[PDB]
Ligand binder design. Structure first.
Ligand code: 6GQ
Length: 233
């Protein structure tokens, strides 16, 4: 299952940009599509999403009246338009495919490699800025929220290696996608969630982000992100 995003673009301030996301090895109609951006060296920010079969969409509050998300069901293509562009809109804009796996019936998400848009703050869950350990140690990364988010909604965790798209590490608080080793585990209780990493390896050095829906915003919220350093000491 594959995602083609349109090419990088340089835009003038005040213009609008329309990014495409074309899916492969399937329609498309049994899934949802979310858009998430990341300014250089910064965290992850949800823009909006759509469910193609219903033709409905929802947009993050801070972009209301600026983002338009649409879908062409026949061609398996989703589009995000952002108008009134400014410097602050410089970012990598990611297409995310999400829903339920055929047969096994569990959650999955897949991120595209993103489209760089170059031109010319929002609620986030709380995470420590950094963590560290040496090979073979354990570490825990915390994520604090409130009733309307972590308290009532499923927490996901994402791993971001430098120069790569985020990747799903934990879903539904504590479930591991196939391919993620058992030394990663997730937990949540009340308004807090935690990612535990056993048997630390140098390749685990990355940024880790927790995330959940927030009932008050009616939008998806990411944590501030934690840079994990593995000290080959
Ligand atoms: C009327 C209407 C239509 C469509 C949408 S929606 O596409 O935003 N959506 C399915 C909500 C939702 O539960 N998400 C989307 C955000 N999520 C994301 C987004 C990015 C990465 C991971 N997870 C999953 C939960 C909301 C309302």
């Amino acid at each position: 299952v594959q995602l083609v995003e349109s090419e990088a673009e340089v835009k003038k301030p005040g213009s609008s940009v329309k990014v495409s996301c074309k899916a492969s090895g399937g329609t498309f109609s049994s899934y949802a599509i979310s858009w998430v951006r990341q300014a250089p060296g910064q965290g992850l920010e949800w823009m909006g999403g759509t469910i193609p079969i219903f033709g409905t969409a929802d947009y993050a509050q801070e972009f209301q009246g600026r983002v338009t998300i649409t879908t062409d069901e026949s061609t398996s293509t989703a589009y995000m338009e952002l108008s009134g562009l400014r410097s602050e809109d410089t970012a990598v804009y990611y297409c995310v495919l999400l829903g339920t796996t055929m047969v096994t019936g569990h959650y999955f998400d897949y991120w595209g490699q993103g489209t760089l848009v170059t031109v010319s703050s929002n609620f986030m869950l709380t995470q420590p800025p950094s963590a560290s350990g040496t090979p073979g140690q354990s570490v825990t990364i915390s994520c604090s929220g409130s009733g309307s988010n972590i308290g009532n909604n499923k927490v996901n965790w994402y791993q971001q290696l430098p120069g790569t798209a985020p990747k799903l590490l934990i879903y539904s608080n504590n479930q591991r996608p196939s391919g993620v080793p058992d030394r990663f585990s997730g937990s949540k209780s009340g308004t807090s969630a935690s990612l535990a990493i056993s048997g630390l390896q140098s390749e685990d050095e990355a940024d880790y982000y927790c995330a959940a829906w927030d009932d008050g915003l009616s939008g998806y919220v990411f944590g501030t992100g934690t840079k994990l350093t593995v000290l080959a000491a």
